Ligand binder design. Structure first.
Ligand SMILES: CC(=O)N[C@H]1[C@@H](O[C@H]2[C@@H](O)[C@@H](CO)O[C@@H](O)[C@@H]2O[C@@H]2O[C@@H](C)[C@@H](O)[C@@H](O)[C@@H]2O)O[C@H](CO)[C@H](O)[C@@H]1O
Length: 389
């Protein structure tokens, strides 16, 4: 028997050393293991496609690491996915899964566990801000402070303010969390009245206006294609998580911050997700793999080698940052501490409202960058699109 494990760590160690570290973690589990063999399969392209193509025709990949992506809602309805909570309970792994335990709980059931937490503030270039005379992220008490800082930076040439596209939903996600009503919207699945909802409409409009001011030229991509520009000093701010630290530590000009009014993103994300339709032996090896990726020793590697925030609460991130000589581990701990000490913390749209709502909002924010789009009627048509899904 073969247990197929799909992940997105396909990168050569020369393009992203983290991928190689992860792959070393996986086939070390394979060598550790009986009558069922573990087979890691690195996916080049969309991980959601592997899942969704199997969900159609009523199946599921044996094991998939969704890497922050949300579980298919159709997969849960058809119970293509195993409930992980009994095994966690049961093997005393509440602390090992950390934030996943409460946040990935859907009616007392856990369908996915992310070994790396979706801990997300933002990144900014200290030199570009200083030169523009722009308020740094710690000075952004309101949305208007952020937009005024962005306007100042655009008065300089050679640099654009920020990358828009996928990163622009992080602005929507956090600006919604600026009021109590917006925060409770992100506590439940999305409803028609929630879409409509002055807070939902205002957030949409604020961000779209800023994305349009940011320029249509600067909305053609995802976070991965904006990272290079930021490392090279071509942009002022970069909306990505703490896990960016390894790529970020190379340029000492760039620093962690969080979003206006002291808001940060703190969610689990989708992670290790396992099929319901397997023999007893490969189901228990798959749960053994969850146990492994979530163990004390692996999570130390998750923090120290992989520059990410571990799900395991037994790993002392601060003390490890304390005793490290690594620049990566230093700003990693700094970035995590900022999110942990945010005035308000929100989950990702993807986690709470699902992958479809995530994608629809990203598309609408991207489309709004076009110079000929009226923001008011775009907001209205965006909320028209959300109600239908
Ligand atoms: C769902 C989502 O918004 N994912 C974005 C995000 O993903 C990264 C985080 O989930 C991080 C947590 O520490 O783990 C990273 O592995 C993950 O990166 C992505 O997934 C892995 C498996 C690889 O395929 C990576 O190349 C891929 O980026 O952040 C990235 C940018 O850092 C993207 O915006 C993702 O869309």
């Amino acid at each position: 028997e073969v247990l197929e494990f799909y992940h997105g760590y396909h990168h050569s160690e020369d393009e992203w050393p983290v991928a190689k570290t992860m792959r070393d973690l996986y086939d070390k589990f394979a060598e550790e293991h009986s009558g069922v063999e573990f087979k890691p399969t690195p996916v080049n392209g969309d991980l959601k496609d592997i899942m969704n193509n199997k969900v159609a025709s009523g199946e599921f990949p044996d094991v998939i690491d969704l890497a922050g992506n949300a579980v298919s809602l159709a997969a849960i309805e058809q119970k293509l996915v195993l409930d992980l909570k009994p095994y966690i309970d049961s093997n005393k792994l509440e602390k090992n899964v950390g934030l996943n335990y409460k946040q990935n709980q859907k009616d007392g059931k856990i369908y996915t566990v992310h070994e790396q937490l979706f801990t997300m503030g933002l990144w900014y270039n200290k030199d570009i801000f200083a030169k523009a005379g722009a308020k740094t992220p710690d000075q952004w008490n309101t949305w208007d402070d952020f937009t005024q800082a962005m306007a100042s930076i655009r008065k300089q040439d050679g640099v654009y303010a920020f990358g828009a596209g996928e990163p622009s939903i992080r602005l929507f996600n956090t600006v919604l969390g600026t009021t109590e009503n917006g925060r409770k919207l992100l506590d439940k699945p999305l409803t028609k009245e929630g879409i409509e909802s002055k807070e939902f409409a205002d957030a949409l409009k604020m961000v779209m206006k800023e994305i349009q001011a940011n320029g249509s030229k600067n909305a053609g991509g995802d976070a991965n294609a904006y990272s290079k520009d930021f490392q090279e000093g071509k942009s002022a701010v970069f909306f990505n998580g703490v896990w960016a630290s390894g790529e970020m530590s190379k340029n000492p000009s760039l620093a962690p911050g969080i979003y206006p009014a002291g808001v940060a993103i703190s969610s689990s994300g989708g992670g290790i997700t396992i099929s319901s339709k397997m023999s007893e032996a490969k189901q228990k090896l798959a749960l053994e793999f969850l146990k492994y990726m979530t163990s004390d020793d692996v999570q130390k590697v998750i923090f120290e080698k992989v520059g990410a925030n571990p799900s395991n609460e037994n790993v002392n991130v601060k003390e490890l940052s304390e005793k490290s000589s690594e620049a990566t581990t230093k700003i990693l701990g700094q970035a995590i501490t900022q999110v942990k000490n945010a005035k308000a913390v929100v989950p990702t749209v993807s986690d709470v409202w699902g992958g479809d709502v995530h994608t629809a909002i990203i598309n609408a924010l991207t489309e709004s960058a076009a110079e000929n789009v009226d923001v008011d009627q775009k907001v209205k048509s965006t909320q028209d699109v959300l109600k239908s899904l």
